[PDB]
């Protein structure tokens, strides 16, 4: 087996299927994105970037949450295509493919979200907006509680100084996870996971000779992400049950349903 080639194939699939990557994001973040730092600039950005959503209107927090869900829906679609290009994934039982994506997509979403975040805010709307961390904190409860744990994760994740070649393999390892609930062919998935994790381990050795614990750091980040998602799903349920105007998109409803 050629591990260098598997890593390159996974990286190529990542560059092909995700609209945002860390190089693209850093170019934009270096300095164009419309800066959203208060309600006036939110409303201006909406009229330019999501005009249809404010041509009527819901509460600002509910409109923001709608844009959050639209982003997630788009990233789930990109993740599904990426997964179909992961060598070995397509040979799995279609039911197991669904299970792996169901439990993995939000872990992958929050891992990749780090690439568009800095300590002050995050890129949104296909790189055309930058919404500040302080503005998101300023929203009424419960909506101000959505993004802050994700910024906290991202600041430490970004301090690892990974590049897209690393992150692509990390996202592949997140998806190819043999302990998801309800898998049919656990044995085969575990062997697929072992293979991807082996490629990740060797890649980190080659790409980050300076950090001899980077691989176990990333295993821990995978566990951190599972907890982050469990907590995120709990908050989404609170929103679903107490916020009538915050309609949940059907693909995200099917992902969350019976998850944790």
């Amino acid at each position: 087996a050629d591990l260098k080639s598997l890593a390159k194939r996974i990286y190529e699939a990542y560059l092909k299927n995700f609209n945002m990557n860390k190089v693209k994001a850093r170019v934009i973040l270096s300095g164009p994105p419309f800066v959203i730092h208060d309600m006036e600039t939110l409303c201006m950005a909406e009229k330019t970037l999501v005009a249809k959503l404010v041509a009527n209107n819901k509460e600002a927090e509910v409109r923001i949450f709608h844009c959050c869900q639209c982003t997630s829906v788009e990233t789930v679609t990109e993740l599904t295509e990426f997964a179909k290009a992961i060598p070995g994934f397509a040979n799995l039982d279609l039911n197991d493919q669904v299970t792996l994506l169901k439990y993995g997509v939000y872990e992958a979403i929050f891992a990749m979200l780090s690439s568009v975040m800095n300590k002050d805010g995050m890129l949104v709307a296909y790189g055309n907006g930058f919404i500040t961390r302080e503005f998101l904190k300023s929203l009424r409860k419960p909506f101000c509680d959505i993004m802050e744990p994700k910024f906290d994760f991202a600041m430490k994740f970004n301090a690892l100084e990974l590049d897209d070649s690393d992150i692509s393999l990390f996202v592949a390892a997140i998806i190819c996870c043999g302990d998801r609930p309800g898998l049919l062919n656990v044995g085969h998935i575990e062997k697929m996971q072992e293979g991807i994790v082996h490629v990740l381990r060797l890649h980190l050795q080659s790409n980050h000779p300076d950090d001899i614990f980077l691989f176990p750091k990333l295993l821990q980040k995978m566990a951190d992400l599972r907890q982050l998602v469990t907590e995120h799903a709990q908050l989404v349920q609170i929103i679903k049950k107490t916020e009538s105007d915050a309609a949940l998109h059907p693909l995200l409803q099917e992902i969350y349903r019976d998850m944790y």
Partner: peptide, 10 residues
């Protein structure tokens, strides 16, 4: 039970 995901996967 995952009609959309199942469709996206096809």
């Amino acid at each position: 039970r995952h009609k959309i995901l199942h469709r996206l996967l096809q």
